[PDB]
């Protein structure tokens, strides 16, 4: 029977799917909870700012303000953006699929090229990010050859120290690729503590909202900064990739334990209810 196996699979697909569906639902309700209020208070005070700009400047008639705002919304569809190096940045947002999109093509040619550039770049960059991960993996693999010797000749031994080693990756990894660069961005970009960490995560997961961008504002940047941030991305993507994947297997583990633990609760209500 071969449809027997596919019904085993589609059972597993559907349950995950509903987990995702319900993870979204829980998510949605927490975001609306967090953002609906702050959306109201920003919408009442933006109508305050508006009528206060008719009274604090009686020169402005009510009719020609509507015209200005149309002109500004029009110019949010443009904003140099496409200078010799921000177009290099842009090519970066494509092939990493971070895609901040503060900058995005407007020419139909630029869109058509971007389509081609992506279908060829996103694979290509991939191979780099695998090598970047290969080397960086054997770097930390040597690192545990040094730490899995001095702690393994004494106090409590194997099968739990794997749980200690994985902590050292996440802890040192957070420092090198989350903490240290967030501190840098705090000073250089002017972001708060939270915003910098936020920007790290959003960008290294390649979510890349682009509500925050490293380099995006009109500051003096020391000519070493932006290229250090390239290297950070190049390396830090390969880090989160493993980080996300590690979380991946943890879910697999949790899903086994929980599934069989439900089975335990079942087998003890049965023989609790047989007992009359």
Ligand X SMILES: CS(=O)(=O)Nc1ccc(C(=O)NCc2ccc(Cl)cc2Cl)cc1
Ligand Y SMILES: CCCCCCCCCCCCCCCC
Q: What are phi and psi of 206, to 5 degrees?
A: 70, 15
Question: Is 177 part of any known ligand binding site?
Answer: no
Contact flag: residue 27 with ligand LNK (CB under 6 A):
no
Instruction: Work out what residue 147 binds among ligand Y, its own copies, ligand X, none; the CB cut-off runs from 5 to 8 Å by kind.
Output: none
Site for ligand X in 41-80 (CB under 6 A): none
- At its nearest, how many Å lie between ligand LNK and the CB of residue 15? 7
6 binds ligand Y (CB under 6 A): no
Chain positions 155 to 214 lying near ligand D10, rule: CB under 6 A, are 176, 180-181
Nearest to 101 by CA among 201, 109, 92: 92
Query: In this structure, what token pair is assigned to residue 42?
Result: 């920003």
Which listed residue (13, 228, 247, 254) binds ligand D10 by CB under 6 A? 228
* 206 neighbors 192 (Cβ within 8 angstroms): no
Euclidean distance between the first and final Cα of the chain, in Å? 41
Instruction: Please say whether the beta carbons of 225 and 232 come within 8 A.
Output: no
**Near ligand D12 in 186-225, by CB under 6 A:** 193-194, 197
Q: Is 34 in the site for its own copies (CB under 8 A)?
A: yes
84 lines the binding site for ligand LNK (CB under 6 A):
yes
CB of 108 to ligand Y, least distance (A): 6
Q: How far is the CB of 70 from ligand LNK (least distance, A)?
A: 32
Q: Which of 7, 19, 30, 167 binds ligand LNK (CB under 6 A)?
A: 19
Query: Which residue among 4, 8, 55, 75 contacts its own copies (CB under 8 A)?
Result: 75
d(CA 86, CA 92) in angstroms, rounded, equals 9
**Binds 1, which of ligand D12, its own copies, ligand UND, none (CB < 5 to 8 A, cut-off by type)?**
its own copies
216 Cβ contact partners less than 8 Å away, ≥ 6 residues apart? 100, 102
Q: Residue 199 to residues 12, 142, 222, 272: CA-CA distances in angstroms?
A: 35, 30, 20, 53
- Scan residues 109-138 and list those touching ligand Y (CB under 6 A): 109, 112-113, 120
Under rule CB under 6 A, residue 197 binds ligand X: no
Residue 208 labeled ligand binder = yes
Binding site partner of 108, from ligand UND, ligand Y, ligand D12, none, Cβ cut-off 5-8 A by kind: ligand Y
Residue ranges in contact with ligand LNK by CB under 6 A: 19, 84-85, 254-255, 258-259
Q: Which residues are annotated as a binding site for K(+)?
A: 97-100, 206-209
Residue ranges in contact with ligand UND by CB under 6 A: 3, 6-7, 10, 258
């Amino acid at each position: 029977s071969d449809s027997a196996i596919n019904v085993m699979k589609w059972k597993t697909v559907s349950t995950i799917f509903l987990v995702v569906v319900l993870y979204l639902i829980i998510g949605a309700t927490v975001f609306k909870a967090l953002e609906q209020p702050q959306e109201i208070s920003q919408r009442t005070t933006i109508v305050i700012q508006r009528e206060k700009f008719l009274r604090a400047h009686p020169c402005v008639s009510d009719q020609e303000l509507d015209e200005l705002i149309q002109q500004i919304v029009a110019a949010i569809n443009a904003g140099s953006h496409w200078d010799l190096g921000s177009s290099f940045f842009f090519a970066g947002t494509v092939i990493t699929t971070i895609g901040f999109g503060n900058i995005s093509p407007r020419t139909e040619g630029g869109k058509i090229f971007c389509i081609i550039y992506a279908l060829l770049g996103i694979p290509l960059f991939g191979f780099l990010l695998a090598g970047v991960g290969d080397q960086l993996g054997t770097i930390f693999g040597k690192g545990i050859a040094k730490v899995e010797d001095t702690f393994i000749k004494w106090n409590v031994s194997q099968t739990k120290i794997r749980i200690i080693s994985t902590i050292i990756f996440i802890l040192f990894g957070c420092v090198l690729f989350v903490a240290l660069p967030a501190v840098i961005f705090k000073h250089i970009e002017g972001w708060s503590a939270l915003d910098a960490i936020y920007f790290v995560v959003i960008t290294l997961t390649t979510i890349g909202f682009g509500d925050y961008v490293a380099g995006g504002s009109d500051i003096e940047y020391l000519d070493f900064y932006k290229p250090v941030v390239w290297f950070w991305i190049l390396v830090g993507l390969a880090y989160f990739a493993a980080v996300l994947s590690m979380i991946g297997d943890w879910l697999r583990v949790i899903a086994k334990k929980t599934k069989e633990a439900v089975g335990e609760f079942r087998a003890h209500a049965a023989e609790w209810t047989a007992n009359v």
